[PDB]
């Protein structure tokens, strides 16, 4: 025998899962039931719970458990028992077909997943239909099985091979005639049952999505006529409407090429056009369910025929009546309707942009302005709105979505023509405030893209904005400020408007809800007009000093400092270093105050960061850098602040971020900070392993790696930082638990291998780094994997790069040692992670590493790759001999790195 859980124990656990008075008692039962599902005991327990049929809770748990075991643990079943499990599942769904629909889907999903993994069940669709089609009570669950079976063909949670999946799809296509014939019988029998038609529609759309239905046979098929028949009738409920809408969208989306499926395309095209009457009927009854459904059908129709709309507009399947349907939907007062079609308008603009033909553009010009006219009305705030427009709720994100869409479609109208059009509608009619606000919002979207040569109509709009009194609505003042920020180029070309614009932005800067928008606009004027801004610099510094007392958001304050730093860099070298110590002291003194106290230096660290980041003056003739002097004044308080909050990863992160831009700004200068910073970095990293010290070290190596006097100190820093790093990675699941450490470690190693490779390759710490690099390729992490692959790529490239250099033969020899001891292991680990461990996003990075290995020694790579292919688990025909052979041929006989990537895509696809 053996220890097994008993039926009484699981029934008591299932009851406790739903009905335990102690709320912690049901999470205690949930944990144990989860342990049961992942155990070998779950097979028999689920079967017996489904045979007893005690209640809905126990039967649902058993059905879900059966599904999970079949899709995750099918190897636990002996092949001898596959047929017994199928018969049991078919028996269970028969007995429980009326107990609960949610139980039936789980059993249907189990039957589907079982068939997909049981090739001995040949023609399962045929056996299922000619066993249950004659019983009207068995049709509901028969359709459920036939609905979820195509869905599970591409289930990520199943991991069937690409070769097996091709067998499945062409076997399901062979029986597509019988499932279509079953659906026609399902509408002849009980065709008035609304629930029956929904099951017929969901099954039809599922087989459309799989792409196995006959196009010409479905074109002349009554199922498609019934589909549009119910979408015309007003009496159809919301459930049947959604089922029919999804199926029409599935049929339209199933047409990937309009000429191959021309008879079907014409039938669908004619069908949706007849739904316009039903659309207006749905709008009159305020049935927002159907309205959104029709807009999805309309949007998908234009998506399916987007090629014909652009190629032959106004003729045949390019008939512009399709766009007229979308413009009708754009007229609906609810903005949730028009935003359904926003993706199509992007594609239309993208395709119209490709065809560099202004004659084709002119065909659609009217349709875009007609759409833009509707989008401007949707952006209108309510007439009783209080303050500035929201930018974080549903209506705020919609306005930002419209702003991006108008920027991408404005070329079809002409930015200059559309800008003056919106501005002319503002003078006449005495518009309400919410209308003037929305029109100003659209104008701000296209202001950056209008040619600033036609000054008259442009410079007079800017002139009218600064003359706005404070009596105007807050939202109108808010949007007008952002418009000025977008018109920074018209100010640079007409410099006489600088003072009126700066003055107007000053007033909004001194108001609370306009402070952020005014700081953003001031920043835009600073970066664009930084030439003739030396006069207004003194005023900017005054704002930079008393910056903290302005009710500015952290982003607005940083952006305001960025603008002041840009105009400062254009000043003479004397005035730069003079004003820089002042602007930093107001942040330095505040940092000293925090050392005598909540005390959160994040704000003042970020303010020092943005100052160093954008203070890049033209230093020539061997002059001293103005920021170097300020770095030595700033260093002690930074080191003091860093040592206090050394345990807080967030504050340390902002400290190193400020130190990053400080070193970047000065460059090889400020070498005095090398010894005290590196010393503090190693000491703090010994107790608290913040990965940002590895990144900060990479900046030092990137900035001082080429100077021979620093290569030893940097190598000592690397050997020092690697001791606590390896202990962090040697822990169980250390790679998965510390991915940021893996990321920043090979950022440091990459900067080392490209600034001083001979120093690293001839050291002792390069051996553990190489071993961790090969081990880190298994880590499923976007930033970590990109950093590791980049290191391996540049490490191997060292034996090829700069063949003109004096030390080329030494690098070639040093890389040959790495190739001999680790070359075969690297190719095998790279092939292993691509097929089993990593998602497809890593393939271009892996391909670049494989490409570099072929550059160093191509014939030896052919041998290493042939070995890794032979010793590869060719099982999920998982990998045929021709597929192994073609892969080795495509990689080794590749002339570009792209060919290695394409070979990885095809080969790696076989394992998922």
């Amino acid at each position: 025998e053996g220890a097994k859980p008993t039926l009484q124990l699981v029934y008591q656990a299932v009851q406790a899962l739903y009905h335990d008075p102690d709320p912690s008692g049901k999470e205690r039962a949930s944990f144990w039931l989860g342990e049961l599902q992942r155990s070998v005991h779950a097979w028999e327990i689920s079967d017996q719970l489904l045979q007893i049929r005690q209640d809905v809770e126990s039967c649902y748990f058993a059905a879900q458990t059966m599904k999970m075991k079949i899709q995750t643990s099918f190897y636990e079943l002996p092949t001898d028992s596959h047929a017994s499990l199928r018969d049991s599942l078919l028996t269970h769904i028969q007995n429980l077909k009326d107990l609960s629909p949610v139980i039936v889907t789980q059993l249907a999903l189990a039957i589907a997943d079982l068939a997909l993994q049981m090739p001995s069940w040949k023609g399962c669709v045929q056996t299922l239909v000619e066993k249950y089609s004659n019983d009207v009570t068995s049709l509901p669950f028969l359709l459920e099985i036939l609905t979820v079976l195509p869905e599970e063909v591409h289930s990520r949670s199943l991991r069937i091979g690409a070769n097996r999946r091709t067998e499945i799809i062409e076997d399901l296509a062979f029986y597509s005639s019988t499932v279509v014939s079953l659906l026609m019988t399902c509408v002849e029998k009980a065709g008035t049952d609304e629930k029956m038609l929904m099951k017929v529609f969901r099954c039809l759309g599922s087989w459309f999505n799989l792409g196995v239905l006959d196009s010409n046979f479905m074109a002349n098929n009554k199922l498609l006529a019934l589909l549009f028949e119910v979408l015309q009738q007003d009496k159809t409920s919301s459930n049947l409407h959604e089922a029919a809408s999804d199926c029409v969208c599935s049929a339209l989306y199933a047409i990937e090429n309009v000429e191959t499926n021309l008879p079907l395309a014409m039938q669908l095209f004619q069908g949706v056009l007849t739904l316009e009457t039903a659309y207006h009927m749905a709008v009159a009854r305020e049935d927002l369910d159907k309205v959104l459904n029709y807009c999805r059908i309309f949007t998908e129709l234009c998506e399916t025929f987007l090629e014909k709309i652009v190629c032959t507009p106004g003729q045949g399947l390019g008939d512009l009546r399709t766009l007229e349907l979308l413009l009708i939907c754009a007229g609906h007062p609810q903005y949730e309707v028009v935003e359904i079609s926003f993706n199509f308008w992007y594609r239309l603009g993208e395709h119209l942009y490709k065809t560099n033909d202004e004659v084709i553009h002119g065909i659609f010009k009217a349709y875009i302005q007609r759409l833009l006219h509707a989008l401007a009305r949707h952006c209108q705030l309510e007439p009783d709105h209080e303050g500035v427009p929201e930018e974080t709720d549903d209506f705020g994100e919609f306005r930002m979505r419209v702003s991006d869409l108008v920027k991408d479609l404005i070329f079809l109208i002409g930015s200059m023509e559309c800008f003056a059009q919106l501005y002319s509608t503002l003078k006449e009619g005495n518009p309400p405030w919410e209308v003037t606000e929305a029109v100003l919002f659209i104008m701000a979207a296209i202001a950056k893209s209008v040619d600033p040569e036609n000054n008259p109509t442009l410079v007079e709009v800017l002139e009218g904005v600064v003359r706005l009194p404070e009596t105007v609505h807050t939202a109108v003042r808010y949007t007008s400020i952002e418009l000025v920020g977008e018109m920074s180029e018209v100010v640079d070309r007409n410099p006489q408007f600088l003072d009126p614009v700066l003055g107007y932005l000053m007033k909004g800067l001194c108001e609370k809800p306009l402070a952020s928008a005014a700081a953003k606009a001031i920043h835009n004027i600073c970066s664009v007009c930084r030439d003739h801004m030396a006069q207004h610099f003194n005023g900017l510094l005054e704002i930079a000093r008393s910056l903290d007392s302005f009710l500015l958001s952290p982003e607005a304050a940083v952006g305001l400092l960025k603008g002041t730093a840009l105009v400062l860099a254009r000043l003479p070298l004397d005035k730069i270093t003079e004003c820089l110590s002042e602007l930093c002291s107001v942040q330095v003194m505040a940092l000293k105050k925090l050392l005598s106290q909540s005390s959160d230096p994040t704000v003042f660290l970020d303010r020092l960061a943005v100052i160093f980041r954008h203070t890049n003056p033209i230093v020539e003739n061997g002059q001293t850098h103005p920021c170097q002097k300020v770095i030595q004044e700033i260093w002690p308080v930074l080191s003091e602040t860093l040592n206090k909050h050394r345990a807080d990863n967030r504050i340390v992160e902002r400290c190193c971020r400020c130190l990053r831009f400080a070193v970047r700004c000065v460059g090889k200068g400020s070498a005095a900070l090398l010894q005290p910073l590196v010393t503090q970095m190693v000491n703090v990293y010994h107790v608290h392993q913040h990965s940002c010290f590895l990144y900060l070290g990479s900046i030092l190596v990137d900035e001082y790696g080429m100077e021979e006097g620093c290569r030893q100190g940097l190598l000592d820093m690397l050997q020092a930082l690697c001791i606590p790093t390896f202990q962090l990675l040697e822990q169980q699941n250390g790679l998965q638990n510390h991915p940021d450490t893996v990321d920043d470690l090979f950022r440091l190693a990459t900067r080392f291998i490209q600034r001083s490779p001979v120093t690293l390759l001839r050291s002792q710490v390069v051996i553990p780094i190489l071993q961790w690099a090969i081990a880190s390729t298994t880590l499923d992490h976007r930033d970590a994997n990109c950093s590791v692959m980049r290191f391996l790529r540049d490490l191997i490239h060292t034996g090829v790069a700069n063949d003109h250099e004096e030390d080329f033969e030494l690098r070639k020899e040093l890389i040959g040692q790495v190739m001999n001891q680790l070359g075969q292991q690297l190719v095998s680990q790279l092939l292993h992670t691509c097929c089993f461990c990593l998602p497809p996003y890593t393939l271009p990075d892996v391909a670049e590493v494989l490409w570099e290995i072929m550059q160093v020694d191509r014939p030896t790579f052919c041998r290493w790759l042939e070995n890794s292919l032979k010793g590869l688990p060719k099982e999920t025909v998982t990998v045929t001999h021709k597929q192994l052979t073609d892969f080795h041929k495509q990689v080794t006989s590749a002339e570009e790195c792209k060919q290695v990537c394409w070979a990885l895509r095809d080969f790696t696809r076989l394992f998922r």
């Binding site: 992160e653 971020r657 940002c692 990321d743 930033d783 990109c786």
Partner: peptide, 9 residues
């Protein structure tokens, strides 16, 4: 969110 790195080259 507070962690910021430099982009690729």
């Amino acid at each position: 969110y507070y962690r910021e790195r430099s982009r690729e080259r």
